[PDB]
Write a protein that holds these residues in place. Sequence first.
Motif, PDB file in Angstrom:
ATOM      1  N   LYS A 129      23.673 -40.283 -54.124  1.00 41.13           N
ATOM      2  CA  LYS A 129      22.578 -39.924 -54.803  1.00 41.13           C
ATOM      3  C   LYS A 129      21.615 -40.536 -54.596  1.00 41.13           C
ATOM      4  N   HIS A 130      21.632 -41.863 -53.797  1.00 42.49           N
ATOM      5  CA  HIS A 130      20.641 -42.648 -53.663  1.00 42.49           C
ATOM      6  C   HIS A 130      20.169 -42.833 -52.068  1.00 42.49           C
ATOM      7  N   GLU A 131      19.017 -43.010 -51.856  1.00 44.26           N
ATOM      8  CA  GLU A 131      18.449 -43.251 -50.603  1.00 44.26           C
ATOM      9  C   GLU A 131      18.624 -44.468 -50.379  1.00 44.26           C
ATOM     10  N   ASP A 132      18.727 -44.944 -49.047  1.00 39.28           N
ATOM     11  CA  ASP A 132      18.968 -46.388 -48.311  1.00 39.28           C
ATOM     12  C   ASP A 132      18.080 -47.311 -48.960  1.00 39.28           C
ATOM     13  N   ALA A 133      16.861 -47.055 -49.124  1.00 46.18           N
ATOM     14  CA  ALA A 133      15.762 -47.871 -49.436  1.00 46.18           C
ATOM     15  C   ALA A 133      15.892 -48.314 -51.040  1.00 46.18           C
ATOM     16  N   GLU A 134      16.718 -47.862 -51.915  1.00 42.62           N
ATOM     17  CA  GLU A 134      16.586 -48.229 -53.318  1.00 42.62           C
ATOM     18  C   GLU A 134      17.709 -49.151 -53.410  1.00 42.62           C
ATOM     19  N   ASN A 135      18.388 -49.667 -52.363  1.00 40.31           N
ATOM     20  CA  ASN A 135      19.426 -50.939 -52.388  1.00 40.31           C
ATOM     21  C   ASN A 135      20.141 -50.618 -53.533  1.00 40.31           C
ATOM     22  N   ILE A 136      20.709 -49.613 -53.602  1.00 43.85           N
ATOM     23  CA  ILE A 136      21.977 -49.175 -54.584  1.00 43.85           C
ATOM     24  C   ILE A 136      23.162 -48.823 -53.928  1.00 43.85           C
ATOM     25  N   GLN A 194      28.696 -49.954 -60.093  1.00 41.47           N
ATOM     26  CA  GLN A 194      27.397 -49.806 -59.085  1.00 41.47           C
ATOM     27  C   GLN A 194      27.125 -51.289 -58.772  1.00 41.47           C
ATOM     28  N   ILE A 195      26.646 -51.441 -57.616  1.00 43.39           N
ATOM     29  CA  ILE A 195      26.198 -52.885 -57.276  1.00 43.39           C
ATOM     30  C   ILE A 195      24.813 -52.913 -56.477  1.00 43.39           C
ATOM     31  N   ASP A 196      24.353 -54.326 -56.813  1.00 43.64           N
ATOM     32  CA  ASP A 196      22.811 -54.546 -56.367  1.00 43.64           C
ATOM     33  C   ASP A 196      22.900 -54.551 -54.715  1.00 43.64           C
ATOM     34  N   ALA A 197      23.749 -54.528 -54.195  1.00 49.68           N
ATOM     35  CA  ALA A 197      23.923 -54.608 -52.783  1.00 49.68           C
ATOM     36  C   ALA A 197      23.595 -53.134 -52.290  1.00 49.68           C
ATOM     37  N   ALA A 198      23.024 -53.104 -50.919  1.00 49.91           N
ATOM     38  CA  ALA A 198      22.743 -51.751 -50.365  1.00 49.91           C
ATOM     39  C   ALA A 198      24.261 -51.628 -49.314  1.00 49.91           C
ATOM     40  N   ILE A 199      24.938 -50.439 -49.687  1.00 45.31           N
ATOM     41  CA  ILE A 199      25.861 -49.846 -48.754  1.00 45.31           C
ATOM     42  C   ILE A 199      25.532 -48.948 -47.830  1.00 45.31           C
ATOM     43  N   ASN A 200      25.655 -48.754 -46.593  1.00 42.00           N
ATOM     44  CA  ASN A 200      25.314 -47.847 -45.471  1.00 42.00           C
ATOM     45  C   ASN A 200      26.464 -47.321 -44.970  1.00 42.00           C
ATOM     46  N   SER A 201      26.261 -46.229 -43.917  1.00 40.01           N
ATOM     47  CA  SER A 201      27.235 -45.926 -43.086  1.00 40.01           C
ATOM     48  C   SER A 201      27.846 -47.153 -42.168  1.00 40.01           C
TER      49      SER A 201
END
Lengths: 369, 465, 369, 465, 369
Positions: free
Chosen positions: B176-183, B146-153
């Motif tokens: 399981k995480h929404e994009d605004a959670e930066n997970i 699990q990383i601090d960075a935000a991974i998206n599509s």
Amino acid sequence: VKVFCVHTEPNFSLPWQRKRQYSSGSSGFIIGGRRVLTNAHSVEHHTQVKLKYLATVLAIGTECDIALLTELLGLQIGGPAFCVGIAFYVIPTPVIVHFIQDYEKHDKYTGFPVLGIEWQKMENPDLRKSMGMESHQKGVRIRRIEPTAPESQVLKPSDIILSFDGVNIANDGTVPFRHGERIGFSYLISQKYTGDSALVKVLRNKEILEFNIKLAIHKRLIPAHISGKPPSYFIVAGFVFTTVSVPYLRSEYGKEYEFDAPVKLLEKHLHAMAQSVDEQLVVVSQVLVSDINIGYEEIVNTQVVAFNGKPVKNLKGLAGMVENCEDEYMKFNLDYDQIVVLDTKTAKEATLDILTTHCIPSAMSDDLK
Amino acid sequence: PSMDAVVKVFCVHTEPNFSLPWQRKRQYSSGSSGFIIGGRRVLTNAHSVEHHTQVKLKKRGSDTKYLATVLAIGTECDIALLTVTDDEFWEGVSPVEFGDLPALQDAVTVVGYPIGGDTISVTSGVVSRMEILSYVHGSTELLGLQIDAAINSGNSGGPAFNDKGKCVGIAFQSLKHEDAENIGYVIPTPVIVHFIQDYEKHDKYTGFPVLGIEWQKMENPDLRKSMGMESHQKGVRIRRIEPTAPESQVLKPSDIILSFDGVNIANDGTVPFRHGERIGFSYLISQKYTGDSALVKVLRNKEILEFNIKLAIHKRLIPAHISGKPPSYFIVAGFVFTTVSVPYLRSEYGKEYEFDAPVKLLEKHLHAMAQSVDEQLVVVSQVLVSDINIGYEEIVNTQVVAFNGKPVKNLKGLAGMVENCEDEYMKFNLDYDQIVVLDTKTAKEATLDILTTHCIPSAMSDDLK
Amino acid sequence: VKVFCVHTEPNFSLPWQRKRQYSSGSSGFIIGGRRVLTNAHSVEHHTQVKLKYLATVLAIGTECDIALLTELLGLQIGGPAFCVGIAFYVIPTPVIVHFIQDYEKHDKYTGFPVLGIEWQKMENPDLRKSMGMESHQKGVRIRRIEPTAPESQVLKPSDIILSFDGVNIANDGTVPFRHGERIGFSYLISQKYTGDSALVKVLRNKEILEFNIKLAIHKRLIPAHISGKPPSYFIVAGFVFTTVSVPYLRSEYGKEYEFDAPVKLLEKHLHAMAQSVDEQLVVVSQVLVSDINIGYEEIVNTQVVAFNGKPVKNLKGLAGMVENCEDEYMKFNLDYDQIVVLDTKTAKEATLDILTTHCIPSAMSDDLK
Amino acid sequence: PSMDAVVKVFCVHTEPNFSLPWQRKRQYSSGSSGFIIGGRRVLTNAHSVEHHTQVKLKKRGSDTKYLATVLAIGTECDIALLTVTDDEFWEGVSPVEFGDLPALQDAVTVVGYPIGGDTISVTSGVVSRMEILSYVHGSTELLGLQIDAAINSGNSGGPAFNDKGKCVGIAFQSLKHEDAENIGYVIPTPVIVHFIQDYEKHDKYTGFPVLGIEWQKMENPDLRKSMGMESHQKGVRIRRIEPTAPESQVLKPSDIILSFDGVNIANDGTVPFRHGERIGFSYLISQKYTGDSALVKVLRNKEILEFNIKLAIHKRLIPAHISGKPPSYFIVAGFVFTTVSVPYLRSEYGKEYEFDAPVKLLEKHLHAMAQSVDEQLVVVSQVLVSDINIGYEEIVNTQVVAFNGKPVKNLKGLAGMVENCEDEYMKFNLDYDQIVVLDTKTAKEATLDILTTHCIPSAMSDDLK
Amino acid sequence: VKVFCVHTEPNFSLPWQRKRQYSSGSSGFIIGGRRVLTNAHSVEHHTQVKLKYLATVLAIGTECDIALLTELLGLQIGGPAFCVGIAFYVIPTPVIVHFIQDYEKHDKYTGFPVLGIEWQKMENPDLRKSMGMESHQKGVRIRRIEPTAPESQVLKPSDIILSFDGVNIANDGTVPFRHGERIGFSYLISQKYTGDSALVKVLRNKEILEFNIKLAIHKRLIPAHISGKPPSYFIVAGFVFTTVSVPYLRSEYGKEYEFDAPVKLLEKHLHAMAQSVDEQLVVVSQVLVSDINIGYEEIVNTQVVAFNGKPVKNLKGLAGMVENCEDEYMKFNLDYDQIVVLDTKTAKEATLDILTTHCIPSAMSDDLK
């Protein structure tokens, strides 16, 4: 009445498919003689109909949006009315009575006839004088005539239409309607029945002629609808060929299709006329990607103009030429001066696996058998 | 530096319609990220290329798109392995080199592409925690970062680098995480190594083995006493064992698993992992290969037993996915019979299916074990309206339990029983104590016109013919 | 009238507690014979009642939401009405008159009877023929029968119910109501009084039988309410055992409980029937944390299926077994194949201090004495 | 680096209901931050573990939660001291080491956990100012560091480090600042040292002493002249002295406090603190231990006097908290008698209680001093409706002043007077010149059924039995 | 009518000031006898009045908010009405007629009398019996009596008031009003005129006594208003002394003053009674900063309790003591156990320059001359 229907719609973007079964509701009402009126769309693509039960579908009047269990007169104000028409707007009783009488005398829906002409106003005095119109004469100038209409013979461009069945047509193309109200002359025409005769008085080279013309329904190059019939398609080597209609355009480009569709296609939607009875706008709809068609996969909604040097007139014609093709290569001339070249033997041999991959029942729709 | 090897992945998809299993959806193209490694090879996410019919690859400084080949798909670990025949694609790029498993709070750089864009994007963060998680929901849980960075599509599938320019895995967008959670997550190198080495040995993906057991913590002292555990002993109690993993033979309920491959397991199911770090014991299992054996030490009736057990992949009654295969279906008289899987439920009830699907189905999705290798959950999906089926038109997603007195084990069985039906009546025992009854002769006759009405090519998928 | 009430509600999540005293307001009206009608909820858990003063509570009709100072007929349109019913929606006078007459003849509220059967439509002709129904016959097929109903004897699964008290039941389970309107047959049933007899005509193995059946109130495994009675609980070693009801579920999981509650419990709420008259769904509600129960503290709302090898039927049964337990260990089989093991002597010795910590008056509610 | 010692604190709480003092609220779990120090010890916030029934601790890189022990609770300084029996928890972690009191504008790093999360969070800022503040509202004011960083729930209780990796105290979320103001506090090392050293000597928390006086500035020259102060003299005038701190004996109103433990106090109540820094004189007091003595130099009648005074903790008429004890209550005939404290007021009137509570009560909360060690503010909390109390049902939160002619000093006194009542009538003198009159015999008889109706176990809390 | 007025309001925070001149509008209406009714606030602090012109102000009825050109009866529903009262809510005609008749018989507004007592209900049977009330007796118990009222003599605490002018008072302090409606007994009292007599029947030590009591207007320690009079102030050495009234509180702390004002002052607003006819709440309003008062500048709205050892009763009293002070020091005991000490000679010598700096006309308002 409360109408309950089960619908199975065609997919115009994927013409081998039917959309998922769904149910709807609308209104309608009982008329004398054991019949019920309702909207045509409130029963389109029906597979089962119920009322408040088990109903029967005698005829669908698409153009007039009536069902019995293209520019017509309407009133801007289900399941009508109070009876002054049909709730669509209110589709008036001159249209309703027409629908019933059309069926009741022909045992089928035969639409509303058109004259099949485009026309221009004669409001300018210099325009009028140059064509030999005396000051008391009123009417409209024929701009162009549908090649697929019967009157394409007897009428001519620049004829000035003076009257229809003895009713005077004005310089703005209107006829009297009621006290202090006028209406476009096409109203008179749409009140006739298909196959009826009508007297059209015209001015030609400064002389008056009256023609007795049999009225017919409008053949349009890009059809407004296809009367609940299934959309056609032909496939070879993953190339999906189909014909352009309004439902196709709506399914491809959404509600704003008259702005979003390609300009080449819009021009033909708005301005082209069928030069022949069986002329259709044939396009490559899309390319189902596979080895045989590599380098071709970005062709979308592009007209096919010719096959192996020969003009394409319609979908059936194209399908014939491809099956009879004995040449080493198949060459499709497309719009935008594009060409598609495929080795004939390998392209035909590639079709089946592609059909299997996309669950398509055969290379073509049943109407192309 | 290593940015030359990070490629854009263009994929054409032809997805099955799970609600209308005789159809394929329209072709569409998606874009994602990927990266060149050693030996003319390219890694990317499995989900980026699911149901692929063509894959192309594009380097950052060149317009040319290159036709690619899909070598293997590791769905459980969300990895796709690609190659390219054209040599011009390979020439001039320095291939990504893998580093070791990063420590906690280590800096990580994720390189990839944005959505609908062909320029390089750089995301930064640290490693938050080690985790055991599913990369596909309902599927086997694997090691992950699990990383601090935000991974998206778009940028998921791209490499994640340490401060040494070494790749520590493949970017993965959180389910399981929404994009605004930066997970975000990184599929770590030992899992990637597992996947590649699996391919290199078997010329195919063979999955990730599981111990087909559910367990319960042994943190209560009296519970431990009552089952004969000496005070120095620790471990977990077996609640239930998959009938379709034997395994089922050798292990038994209420065994207390003391260790796995010599590694001591605690009362909470943890095992030591690194200095000051503890993780779930399934990590010792998921790192093995399918077919491998493991030493399992249990306490049974206050006595120690050791078992060498051959490990297999997990067989779920309601599959998390069906390996890109076409969904099975069978039609008689407008009744559409299919099987329940996760894609089916998601297609039927949306992303919230675990709350919106009928409770009978949820129960079996959350709790039921397959009683056999061939067992499937068979349902009436829907009824295609016609005269032959008047009065049944409301039946939707209801389990078929029996046919003419005989229990239904799976779809092929049902299709078989219907083909060989000699009885005057076809009698379907459905859930909620419902029966469907059709006259055998006319029901079979009615099928063709219905198939025609709905443009259904065949009454059954090819797997049942 | 203006109703003024003081309420003391039970806490279903903490069954040894009563919520804080509060007051409310509603409407109602005077009826002949020195009586007042109002909502049942407008006086639920009352400790004092006033009107506009000091009133008396004769009977509470929970199911029909009436108080005199489960699927019934209602009208979708306090403190009613104009009188056409009771404002809830409008609870109609056939329900109201029933309530009053039930009490006026029995000196207590005895609810509304049900037949205690689940049924399926017989609209399919092949289904009908296979069960020996002649074309003129209509009715519904019994799917399953409540084991705790009297008719669980005389009726059988797959019986086709043809009529009730000589009133014809249709294939969709409806009976005539007024001109052009029908209603579900359960309406006829709910109009009867508890203990009344009724003639049920059925088709069984192609033969007609008529049964005279005494009607009773529905016993549900997970009760819709508990008639203003206090919720039960049993405690040992910090383990709080209780029974699942709708108010419990509502208190545990909120207004959306039919979606948020655990699936194992929802299944029993929607689909399970009591196999026995005194069967209750017993769960570990929660664990009051303490040394004796260390490692067990995350068990929440999980069914107890067995104690020391013996099946748990209800809360009283479980409580008995625990007090009589002489074995060294207490073993609870829970759902999800979980077990809870406690040393018997120490677990019993631990109970009191935990009760003191949470201010619980005794190990169990008074109904388990 | 020092991140291995920063732990996650899981706590189960069982809170008393102050509005319904016979009840405990439902169990719930909260998470916060804490850190390992020297000697198998863990520090965290006191409020994080208030009303604890179980505490567990979790290290960043391990799933295992460890059962903890609460050694001591310093409510006034918001510190809890924890330990853990399990050695595996302690092995491998370098314990946090404390640094000196930071200078103004010094860099500070706060390490902890976010809300509902188990990953490390790092907050940064500088030291804004030294401050004397209450860590519990209405309680004794102590030394504190205001910081530029934003401290919230979850990460409060975590260590704050200087640039040398030394801990300068414990993070504390501001009670008086909203989260968007980016203001936080750090409970500084000398206060922590005070708390730990207090425990190590007395085997228990003994609080923080106060000088039980209110004072007034002496900045006006004529005021100073009129009271005989020579021109070089400075200090503060005593306005009032707590009757329950003697102290009360030796000091007198209008004394002028000139110095404390030899340290010169100015006309504004400040004393020098460090180079260029001045702070309130209470810092010289709060740093002492309870039982310690201090030299107080005052001016009385134009003459200097010195007093050695034994310092005690503050006794408030309406307590800021009741040390986790159960709130006292007494019931007769449905009348619920309890005592007024801050938790009571907050429970009764919400967070805005200092504006929404009845003025009579606010006055005594803001201004009244206890006239004796045993004095409590006794009220009728509410009336549990029954026939015996018809016409009184509206009485809410009203002070009881007397019973049958005799003044009420506290709850035990009232309960006592009611038990020994031989008179025909019980006559309660209430505030707002109200009387409640009950027939003694029937009032006592009515109590049981009422207790039963509301599920009240006993007519009184155990402290009154 | 349309009312047009020019207003000059006092500043209660700066009592030596008048706010800027402003104009307003409202409604009213002509009544017989050459008089016009309107709101009292629609002419408060008038300097010129016009109607639709030049009007005259005969009397202002503040409490009843009427002007002729504290708890009274009102109706919840300018410039009224339709006539059923005065638009405020609607101030009813029993209040209006009272206002007119009060003036028409006294040539001045004399307000509405009160009994000057606080009372408690006698609804509890044990309370009633313990005080010797027979079952047929109803009334209310006197809690406390205003020291500045005439009835402070003849009535006593714990007297049970049974009736007023022969009208029975109920246990809830209500009297009959109309059929099915009751009203608080103070209604009867406010219908009387100031100086009128009234018979009050009470129960004292189980014996009935009837007192004939002259009714008077309520003296309040913190006055609801000051009848258009200017606010008073006294100044020395920059210390601004004033008296607490509601308008002062409203001007100091805004519309939410019953929450925002200091608790010590709120207590006296809600609960204190004047112990004497001329008792006022004297506070230091603020300190006008200057050398002489250095170290004192943060004192705001704090009660003065004593000057040089002597109790302060009112503003005039304080002003007297300061002028007559011959001592070397002036010592003010303030609330919160604060003291203010000033050298007498220098403090008096400092006053003038401070007045000049703040443009204050003299050390005190004219009423303190």
